[PDB]
C-alpha cells in the first residue's frame, strides 16, 4: 500500500518541453547508418531514413544536441560545409574513427526540420576558441551581407538556421577530452566566447559545461568556478549522468534515480550560491544534456580497430529493468521542472539509443523507447508537488528507497492529469491510492503498464516481447483513484475532464 | 481577499524551538543595568533584576547566545571567573567601554538558569585561538579531575555547565572586528578550534561564522570558503541581519522579509554546494544568530564618550511598524524550519531589545515584545507549507510583494493549529480564507490582533498604547477559517479541538 | 619540570589520557643516562612555536647565567643536558595532529624555530618533519615544500613507516 495527494494548487512548475530532448553525435552509427543511409529502401532523396524519421516524430523530441559530445572538441565546422569534394577526411580522435564529413551542419539542420526538432548546437572550445565561435553563429544565424552569412547562402541555405540554444564546448573537465581545460581556463574561454556569440546574435542562449559526471574529483568545485567566470553571460549549466547494472543488483539499480535527484539539487545549489555572490537578479537553470543507461556494450567496443568509418560503437541493447530506471530518471526530471529546463536522452539513434537500425534493414524500438515516449507525449503541463507515503527498502548504496517513484502532471489546456509511477518492488504489487479531490469531475481515461517477468529481457529487430499494454486497473471512486501497480512496473495513469 | 491551504500532510518541518532564541552581549546596559543591577529594589540575592527575569520567562526563550558579539573577539574568559578582587578591569575595544568583569560566565549561567534558557557560548577567535577554546570547554563541561574542571568546582560550580552549542568566534569577516580574519584564516582556526573542543566533549555542536551581513563584499564567497575548511567538524553556519526604515517608506520596509527569505535560501545553497563538494552525508543547518530591527539609536550613540562603564548604547525605541516587520521576520524563520534550527533576536535586554529597563526603576515591553512572545509561545510544532494565493504590490526595492505573510504551525500534542499572519496593506483589510478540511473537529479558540493607527507609535515606561487585543473575528465554518485581517496588522489565529 | 606539587594534571588530547607530568624532561634525561642513550628531543610546534623552542634549548643546553639555564640548575641539574639532535615538531601533516599545519605553515615555523634554537646553541642538529607515512595525499609534495623553506637551517628530514599483515 501507498498513498499520494494530487493537489492542483501545490505546483512545482510548468514543464519546459525541452526536458524531452535528445542528442546525436558523430559517433558510431548515429549519423552514418542511423539518420542517414543513402540507398536504404526507406531513404529519401537526401538520403535520410524515413523509418527513423517516423520513430523520432512519435517521441515528439523538441530539441536535439549536435554534433557532440567528445567529437566536437576536435571538430572544425568548416570541414562539414560546402561542396562535398572540398570536404576533408579527418581523424576523429574522440572515437578513433575516420570522419568523412559527408554529413555536416547544414545536412543535420535539414534532418532536424523533418523530425520537427530545433537543434542545440555545440561549438568546439577544445582545439578552437572565440573566433570560430563567433564565425559559426554568424554563418548559422546572420541573415546576409557578411562573408560568413553569404557563405551559408552560397552553400544552398538562403534563410538563416536561427539556432536559439548553443553549448559552449563539451565535457571540458574531462581528462579524456580533446583540449581539456581547467575550470578557470574553461570559464575564461567560455566567457569570452559567450560574449562574441551574443554580440553576433543577442537572441541566443548559452549552456556552460558542468562536470562530466558526479564522481569527478573536481565535481562541484568545477561548476562553482565556471559559473563565477560566466554567470552574467550564460543561461544554463549542464549535467551529464549515465548508469548501469554492472553487479546484477536490481534493487540497488532502480534506486539510482535518488542519486540523480541529489546531483540536480546539488547543481541548483551551486547556481544559487554564485547568483548570491554576484548579487544577480538572473537565475541560472540546468540542462541535463546527457543522460541514459550506458553499460551493456563496454566489452564489445574494446575489440573495435581504430580508423574505420562509422564503427558499431556504444550499441547497448536495453532490457526491461533499464526501461524502469529510465522511467525513474524521467520522473526525476519532472520533479525538478522548476530548474531543469532542457534535458537530452543520450543518444537518439544506434548509440545508447531508444531507436536501433540495421543496414538495408529495419529500425526498431528498444525497451527504453516506451517510457520516454509516454513521458514526452503525456508529460506536458505543470508538474505537481508529490505528497506521498510509500513503504521503503534499503539497498547496497541507498537507504529508505521508496518502492513508489511517482509524479502527476496537470495539463490545464487539455484538462488532463497524468500520473507517472514506477513500482520498484521485486515481489509485490503496490496498491496506490491517489487523493484527487482538487480535480472535480475527472475520470480515468486509461492506465498504461510496461511490465515483463524477466528484467533482463530485451527487444530486437525480430521481436519485441517488452511492450506496453492498457490493462491497468486504475479506477475512480469517491474522489480517490485506486490503482494496482504490478511488481516491477512502469505505469501511466491518465485522467481527464 | 487571500486564500491559504492548511494541510497537515504538506509539511516543511518540525520547528526547532531554538528559533525563538535571543542574545546578550557585554554591550551597553544589556548586562549592567539590564539583567544585573545589585542596587535595584527588585534585585535578588545575586543582584539579578527579578522583574527582568519574569519578562524573559514570559517569552519562553530556550537559548541565549553570550557573551558576544564584537565583545568576545577581545575577551579573556579567565578575567570573568573566580574571586571578584582578582578580576581585572579591561578596556573593551569593541564598544570602547571599561569592562569590570563583575559578571562573568558563571554568573551568566546562574542567570540563564533562572530564566529557563540554555546558553549558546561564544569563544574568542580574534585575539585568542585553539588553546583557549579547549580550556574553556574543559572548564565548562568536563566533570572533574583536571586543572580546569577542578578550577570551576573551586569557583563554586561543582556540576559542569554542560553547554551544548558553541559559537566559533564572532563576525570574523568584519573589518571592524578585533582580530579580523580572512575566510581562509578563519576557516583554518575554526577547524582546529572545532577539533579540540569536540575532543574535550564530543556531545557539543559548533556554529561557524557567516558574513556580518548580506552586503559584505565577501558575502557568499566567505561562507563557501569557511565551510570548505570546516564542514566535517561543525554543525551550523550563522547569518546576521538588521533592518531599518531610514527613508520612511513603510510599504518597502515591510517587504524586507522577502530579502531575509532570499538571504536564507542563498546560505542554504552554499551549505549544500559544500556538502556535494565533500561528498558528505551530513547536512549543515543555519543559525540566524543575530536578527532585529536596528536603526533608531544610531545618532545618539555617536555622542557617547569612550571609557565609561555601561554606556546607554544601541537603545532603539521600537514602534508599531517595527513590530510588524519583526512579525514578518518570525514567519520567515518558521517557513525555513527545515534548515534554520537556531535563531537569536539581538538583543534581549536594553540593547536593541524587546525589554527595556530604567535604573532603580521599571522594566517594560517594547512593541516588538508581542509578536516575539506570540511566535515563541504559540509557534511550537510542525511548520506547514502554505499554498497561498494573495494579492500583491510593488515597492521601490521589491516586486510582487504579497499583502499576506502567513504560515500555520500544527502542534499534534496540544491538538492545536496556529495561523500567524501579517496584512501589509496600508489602507484595506484582507479577507483571509483558510481551507482546513485536513483538520477535523477543530474550532477557533481566539484571534489575537496587534494593530495601531499610527505606525510610528512607540511604547514607554509611562504607557503602552501598542498592545494586543483578542477581538479578531476569525470563525470556522464547513472546514473553512474566514478571518478579517485589519490593515497593518499582526494576527495570531489559534485553533483547537 | 620543577617541584612535583606545582606540576599540573593535563588532558593529553593525542591519546585521550590524563597526563600527570610526574615524569618530565629532567627525569627522562636521568633515565636515558642509565641506559647509555643520548636523547633526540622534540619541541612542540602544534600549540606552541618559536619562543618555546628557544627557551627549551636554553633550559637544556645553556650552562648558566640566564633565567632558563639558572632555572634548570635550581631544578637540580647543574650541568646542562647538552642535547645534540632535536625534532622540529611531530607529524605536522596529519589531519589527526594537534595544531596540524600545511607544508608552507610548517616550513615557515620550522625555519624560524630552527634559527632561534641554533642561535641559542649552534652545536645542535635539527630534524624537520616528513609525511606521517608514504600514503598521505600530500606525500612527497610535503617534503619538497618543507625542505624549500628550511634547507639551509636543518640537517635531516624524517620518515615514518609501519607495516602489518592484515590479510
Curated annotation (Swiss-Prot), chains A, B:
Q: Which residues form the active site?
A: 171, 290
What does its record list under induction?
Transcription is repressed by glucose and by the binding of AraR to the operon promoter. L-arabinose acts as an inducer by inhibiting the binding of AraR to the DNA, thus allowing expression of the gene.
Dependence of activity on temperature: Optimum temperature is 70 degrees Celsius.
Q: Which GO terms describe its cellular component?
A: cytoplasm
Which reactions appear under catalytic activity for this entry?
Hydrolysis of terminal non-reducing alpha-L-arabinofuranoside residues in alpha-L-arabinosides
Primary location group: cytoplasm
Gene Ontology molecular function: any one: alpha-L-arabinofuranosidase activity
* Single Gene Ontology BP annotation: arabinan catabolic process
Would you tell me the protein name for this molecule? Answer: Intracellular exo-alpha-(1->5)-L-arabinofuranosidase
Q: Origin organism of this chain?
A: Geobacillus stearothermophilus (Bacillus stearothermophilus)
Query: Gene for this protein?
Result: abfA
Amino acid at each position: 500500500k501507498a498513498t499520494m495527494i494530487i493537489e492542483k494548487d501545490f505546483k512545482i512548475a510548468e514543464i519546459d518541453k525541452r526536458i524531452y530532448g535528445s542528442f546525436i553525435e558523430h559517433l558510431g552509427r548515429a549519423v552514418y547508418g542511423g539518420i542517414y543511409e543513402p540507398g536504404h529502401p526507406q531513404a529519401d532523396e537526401n538520403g535520410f531514413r524515413q523509418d527513423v524519421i517516423e520513430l523520432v516524430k512519435e517521441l515528439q523530441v523538441p530539441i536535439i544536441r549536435y554534433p557532440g559530445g567528445n567529437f566536437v572538441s576536435g571538430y572544425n565546422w568548416e570541414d562539414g560545409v560546402g561542396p562535398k569534394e572540398q570536404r576533408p577526411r579527418r581523424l576523429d580522435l574522440a572515437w578513433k574513427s575516420v570522419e568523412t564529413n559527408e554529413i555536416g551542419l547544414n545536412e543535420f539542420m535539414d534532418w532536424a526540420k523533418m523530425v520537427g526538432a530545433e537543434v542545440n548546437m555545440a561549438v568546439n572550445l577544445g582545439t578552437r576558441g572565440i573566433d570560430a565561435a563567433r564565425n559559426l553563429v554568424e554563418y548559422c544565424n546572420h541573415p546576409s551581407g557578411s562573408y560568413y552569412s553569404d557563405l551559408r547562402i552560397a552553400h544552398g541555405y538562403k534563410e538563416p538556421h536561427k539556432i536559439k540554444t548553443w553549448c559552449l564546448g563539451n565535457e571540458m573537465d574531462g581528462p579524456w577530452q580533446i583540449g581539456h581545460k581547467t575550470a578557470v581556463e574553461y570559464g575564461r574561454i567560455a566567457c569570452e566566447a559567450a560574449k562574441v556569440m551574443k554580440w553576433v546574435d543577442p537572441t541566443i542562449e548559452l549552456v556552460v559545461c558542468g562536470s562530466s559526471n558526479r564522481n569527478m574529483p573536481t565535481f562541484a568545485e568545477w561548476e562553482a568556478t565556471v559559473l563565477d567566470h560566466t554567470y552574467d553571460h550564460v543561461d544554463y549549466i549542464s549535467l551529464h549522468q549515465y548508469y548501469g547494472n554492472r553487479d546484477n543488483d536490481t534493487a540497488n539499480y532502480l534506486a539510482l534515480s535518488l542519486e540523480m535527484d541529489d546531483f540536480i539539487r546539488s547543481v541548483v545549489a551551486i547556481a544559487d550560491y554564485v547568483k548570491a555572490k554576484k548579487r544577480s537578479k538572473k537565475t541560472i537553470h540546468l540542462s541535463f544534456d546527457e543522460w541514459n543507461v550506458w553499460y551493456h556494450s563496454n566489452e564489445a567496443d574494446k575489440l573495435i580497430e581504430p580508423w574505420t568509418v562509422a564503427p558499431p560503437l556504444l550499441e547497448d541493447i536495453y532490457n526491461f529493468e533499464d526501461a524502469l530506471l529510465v522511467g525513474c530518471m524521467l520522473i526525476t526530471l519532472m520533479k525538478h521542472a522548476d530548474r531543469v529546463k532542457i534535458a537530452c536522452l543520450a543518444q537518439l539513434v544506434n548509440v545508447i539509443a531508444p531507436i536501433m537500425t540495421e543496414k538495408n534493414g529495419p529500425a526498431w524500438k528498444q525497451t527504453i523507447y516506451y517510457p520516454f515516449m509516454h513521458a514526452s507525449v503525456y508529460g506536458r503541463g505543470v508538474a505537481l508537488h508529490p505528497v506521498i507515503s510509500s513503504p521503503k527498502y534499503d539497498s547496497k548504496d541507498f537507504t529508505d528507497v521508496p518502492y513508489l517513484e511517482s509524479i502527476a502532471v496537470y495539463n490545464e489546456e487539455k484538462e488532463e492529469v497524468t500520473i507517472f509511477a514506477v513500482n520498484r518492488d521485486m515481489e509485490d504489487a503496490l496498491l496506490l491510492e491517489c487523493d484527487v479531490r482538487s480535480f472535480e469531475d475527472y475520470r480515468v481515461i486509461e492506465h498504461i503498464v510496461l511490465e515483463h517477468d524477466n528484467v533482463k529481457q530485451t527487444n530486437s529487430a525480430q521481436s519485441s516481447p517488452v511492450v506496453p499494454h492498457r490493462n491497468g486497473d486504475a479506477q475512480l471512486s469517491d474522489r480517490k483513484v485506486s490503482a494496482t501497480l504490478p511488481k516491477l512496473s512502469w505505469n501511466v495513469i491518465r485522467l481527464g475532464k
